[PDB]
Amino acid sequence: YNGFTGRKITSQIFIGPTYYQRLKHMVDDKIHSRARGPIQILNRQPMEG
DNA sequence: GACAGAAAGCTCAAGTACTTAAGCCTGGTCTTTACTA
């Protein structure tokens, strides 16, 4: 049944329990932004990493 | 003066030196100086 309106769904959906894994990769460890931060010593260019 | 031989020359196959080798990103760990003097 549709969660929003309560109407039945015309197609019949395949459902069941399946074993799922959470992986090490998370967005909080990958999100990054830069604006006039640290400057490399030799090239006077933005840092790496 | 006509031939042949010995010449410098020239070109053409093998061998050698040198080059590049995807893009971005995240971590971790280790180490710069150990050894003779």
Method used experimentally: cryo-EM
Spatial separation of the C-alpha atoms in residues A42 and A6, rounded to whole Å: 65
CA A18 → C1' B35, Å? 63
Q: How many CA atoms lie within 13 A of A15 on its CB side?
A: 4
Q: Report chain B positions within 7 A of protein CB atoms.
A: 25-27
What would the two tokens of residue A39 be?
A: 């400057």
**A41 and A48 in contact (C-beta within 8 Å)?**
no
What would the two tokens of residue A6 be?
A: 């309560």
In units of Å, what resolution does this entry have?
Answer: 2.7
